[PDB]
RNA sequence: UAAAAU
RNA sequence: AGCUGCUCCCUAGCAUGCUACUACCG
RNA sequence: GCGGUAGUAGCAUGCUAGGGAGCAG
């Protein structure tokens, strides 16, 4: 169950990086630290907190058309 | 503007060490051999902490070519070697050949003389110049997820909660302040001054460990360069790789260059690069790319000995020995030599490349160069030593976009790194033994041969002043009998007599702690060191592999197995097309299953399931590759012997000795 | 000597087939990364099943996004957009804001006028007047 | 420059260490500052002194390389900038 | 080298090479296209020829697959296979192929000549894929036909830019307009290098033609001007994206209290935003165009982009935008071509302006929130695909009237095109119904709206703005001085010569004629700045001067008469050959010596 | 090779200054009409009278005069300095000049529009 | 034979 | 973007080696 | 009937050269 969230955080940081988010050093530092801290977690309840904090970065900007990719 | 403090060194010597009767040459250019070089550089290491740190480095000077003035380094001032002046420096030239263009574009003189001044408050390392108008912040990306393999592994019971094998090797990402924040770890290199009357004995024993090889210079038509598509350093990487500079120079330009660096000093510039690889800890890893003008020369100086080290079997340094076809078993069977109450032990050097002093690096260079007793003259060997010191031990690192100076310690990406590390490892082990035997109460040593050996060891260190070869051979035989070693570049395994070590007649692990504390400026915790009392289970770890005594056919055999998490992590995380869509990549999994075969013989059970998982995945990959190539065109291939890759007999033959 | 000239043609055929295939795939794979990565991401997210993430994802569908990283401290700020009233009802009951499966105490509402709105002014009737996409600010419980 | 000839002609031999040439002859300095507390003690104001000379500030940027005016570099506004700032100054006589 | 079939969208690698646009076809579809058409060339990963040196057989239906190559039956190897066999052709992905039975319409499009009305009539009743296929192949056919025109060289030098040329005898000479350009090459012995592009203009007398050079290369006697052709880029996005409805307003936030002058448009402004795309059809000179900027400020924060196919249209609506919006407004029209130039406002290079105005062929690839394409009666499916390809936005709005003017479509020479088939969105507006309706005149005199609504529309127009000054003296027109196929008649100009100064206050009228060259005759002996009836259509002025020609099928077109009379404020005149249009005409009759 | 023009291509003219050089200006626009041509200035006639005259005719463009022998370059600075403002640019020698050469400025920058030198 | 393209 | 060491896989060329069968002589 | 060279086809080894991939310090 924690391996699930670790691989998901890998995919999330890769998407964020593809969206040119490392053009702003503050944001990229925040996301990088959240990612490396998720990968080193050792109890699945902190990982989900930092995952919601990390996904908020993608939900912020409007570059990914969310209503389309949510066709379920 | 003062860069030659030669009288102040002599005045300091006469003030503090006045009755020390040996001649002290402030500039080691006037030394008599290599032991004199060590003796005088030991004092220079101390006295150089008084003078200003802006007076060390290249010594530029204005020359004229075709009526145009250049600024180029004639020779460098060193903290350990003093002042050194080039011998062929010619003012007023008409035109530059290829070789001279190479040696004037590799110097840091005109790059640093013509750039903006720099004050970098991020580091404590002395920063020289900024070669351009804006600093560069390099990042590191996260790995790619191979979802098919992960799903497949999950569908067969892997990664369930509370299991033995779980994922701990990932691709960690890093932000902008990662190159410089890691370069700043050179603040761990202090100016250590070694005990010289003991180093001058340890160096003789260490050299005796290297007596069954042969070395010397070779001509430019005998060097071997594997992979000529590697970067060429700075500034040469603006114009091509190493292939371009190995094709543009004839076999006479390279020989002119080599024979030139025996009389002159060429300082170079090292780049620092951020690695992109799997790991278990989030500390960024970086490597030093050295200039082509330095590798091209160190190759002809050192390669004959380096190659004769990697082709010997049964020695102490086990570089070049392979672990397949019964190599692991042979290495362990030869370390266990004959030792009489054997325990095994192994240790760890904390920050081995940043914290290594400079005296031991110079000692490693001298021990490697002791093989040129015929090819080179004496001033030649000194100028080659000065070149190695000016190019890999204090050098102008080019980090980010700006030049800094490097205080000391090994640069990881130079020509002779993995062998200098081995010399330094043996040096520390021999020092530990000397300290452990001299520091014991000679009144209670009952074995009246070891007591007399102690007496003569003291007398040979601190009284007799010329080398005594019979006792050197005697102590070396004692060491090879009671303390057997197996060394790779800083990775050692020692099989030692335990009865002696208990009575303090050979090193223990505390002795390494003390030696590292006072000779290496680090604290080695008892937690990264391991020991082992039961020899039917070999080294707890050596080269990141554990050892297992299995039954292979009729007899018993040592086999190396890895860490299951490592193999799975390499299966699941990659670089975009690699593995992701492995149907184009079936050799990746063949190799990873070659590495994960011994896990089959393991008493645990998930361990073996790793290997079986890899075999079934290869089968599935092939089954769904033929299915696609059949509908793409309409006819299956006519022959593909790829059915051998999912039966165990192809892999077992890689750990059985014939081949 | 005529069976050994189709044994070689039959081999050039294979080493052209097995090369053109991977040259086609190995190039289609690299021409679709920005759109396969996202579908993979959301597949894995939906499979994860965590209400803390489903909440913000659903919310985010109906134009209720946040304006900064969701903080974790028991006291930093969160500024989220609210585009319509039927959104405002389901989340802001009085002065508590229910986002990311938590409870945040609402302190300052401010419409697109960039000027403050009183919380008691927001209701069904008087809604048609406010420049609507608002920005609610709050602090975690 | 005639400054380079000026320092070379004072050498009692003709050769001088390299590490001092950009120190005494360069015409542009670039400071890289990690945090505000360090900016306070080093380049504070619009003219400061380093390497025994008097440098004058012009053009300040940040990690993203976008301009910054010295009015934004206050202490309460410090947590809103890309923190390694790169102050480029010239040599003023 | 792989794609998708044009009919069933399956994987394939075959292209019917004999077709001009080289479309991908699957196995079955390529077999069907080649078994019933003169097209029998195919190209897969490599062309399908007989690979024997000296053989040139190319008919696929008789070729044979040999060893690592395809061979003629005469040059067959001892071991081989036939390519076309069992109702299919051999390509990649053979056994996973889906065969659509649209081969009838596909062959129709592939072998047609675009000369009769049936070709366009079937071009706009097929699936979307075939729609785009027919569009690009039709444009290709037209612009390659343009190559069959004649060539011109020098004859003698007369000045620095008015000279005498020689058209090659026996082949059609191209029309003389500033958008038909020829590149000039000198061929001395030796020396055949480009000297520049040229656009010409027949000046005051023959055979002289004033010209405009791209660079001051001093013209000599040995050069020539050959027309330079153009290429066609294939399309991707469909003509119109599929519709979606909503239950609440999405992406757009309205207002309550700005400029209720757009009063009756509010409920419609909402219905625009609660859909995915909608259309507004409007009789000439009503709330259209007005509606555009009205919705624009109703949604102030909304990014909006405006577009039309005709330059004068986008310019006139940019003017009407300037009349009402913050500036804060740019018209990214054209950097430096379309030599009949345009606006004077801002920028062509920024694309952050909230209001961008341009013409379809020069659109940048931007994001938006609303795209207001204008006058869909003049655009073709090609252009609609161009806009849907370059831009993406949230909503789309199309405004026009199919009863006005269509696209010229030069090559069609028999039959008539009903507006239903002008393009896709005109079809949509007339098949089910403009999903948005607004119809009563604001602009031109009440009486002339009565005239026009009496004829093209069944009568359904009302307005204000009454008299005065309207006249149609049925004026004999003399010599049809026809140099180019565009008519010229200056005895007809003898009426502005009959009314040069006797109009002492009618000084800023606008002159428009159906023919471009007789309008350059208005630019020959000058009365006022003149325009064409095509550079009108979305443009309005106070008083209008108009001249016709003989009763050719050209000028007799009721739609051009509509768009010529309906563009005034309160005065017009019609000088018509007139057999029954002055029996259509609802004004006061005049004569030539009738000046009072 | 030769290529003429229907206009003086970008020749930013003087209005009416130096019409005493009119016997030259009548043909100075010829410079803008063709690519190039030649001129025969017999001894004592219009040598570098034509050249400096056209220099005056176009005071908003960099123009060059060149020679082969340095007696010619001195006679080239001759007949020049008066009709030139100074505002002078005639740089010939960096480290040559077996006899003395130019007299006023530099060799490292090339300032004002009219510059003199030798071909070699 | 009507518009008109880095 | 480093210096080494080991291992698997694919392709090419050459000579050597090996073997079969065909042509010339001894 | 056999010795010698010259051939083709087939086979194994070894060595050079080229490319791809995996692990270790
Ligand atoms: Zn000495
Ligand atoms: Zn040597
Ligand atoms: Zn066809
Ligand atoms: Zn098909
Ligand atoms: Zn044939």
Residue numbers in the entry:
A (entry chain C): 2 to 73
B (entry chain A): 271 to 929
C (entry chain D): 51 to 191
D (entry chain B): 100 to 192
E (entry chain E): 1 to 596
F (entry chain F): 242 to 361
Task: Tell me what the authors wrote about this structure, in their words.
SARS-CoV-2 encodes 16 non-structural proteins (nsp) to assemble a so-called replication and transcription complex (RTC) to facilitate virus replication and transcription. Among them, nsp12 functions as RNA-dependent RNA polymerase (RdRp) by using nsp7 and nsp8 as its auxiliary factors, and nsp13 is identified as a helicase. In nsp13-2, the bound 5′ extension of RNA template is in an extended conformation and lies in an RNA-binding channel formed by nsp13 1A, 1B, and 2A domains, with a direction of its 5′ end in 2A domain and its 3′ end in 1A domain.
Cryo-EM grids were prepared, and preliminary screening revealed ideal particle density with good dispersity. After collecting and processing 4107 micrograph movies, we identified two major classes of mini RTC and reconstructed their structures to the resolution of 2.98 Å (form 1, 83,144 particles (75.6% of total particles)) and 3.84 Å (form 2, 26,768 particles (24.4% of total particles)). For note, because the resolution of form 1 mini RTC is better than that of form 2, we can build six nucleosides of the 5′ extension of RNA template in nsp13-2 in form 1 mini RTC, but only build five nucleosides in nsp13-2 in form 2; nevertheless, the bound 5′ extensions of RNA template in nsp13-2 in two forms are in similar conformation. Hereafter, we use form 1 mini RTC to illustrate the binding of the 5′ extension of RNA template in nsp13-2. The unpaired 5′ extension of RNA template perpendicularly protrudes to nsp13-2 RNA-binding channel from the polymerase catalytic site of nsp12; whereas, no extra density can be observed around nsp13-1. Although the overall architectures of two mini RTCs are generally similar, the conformations of nsp13-1 have a distinct shift.
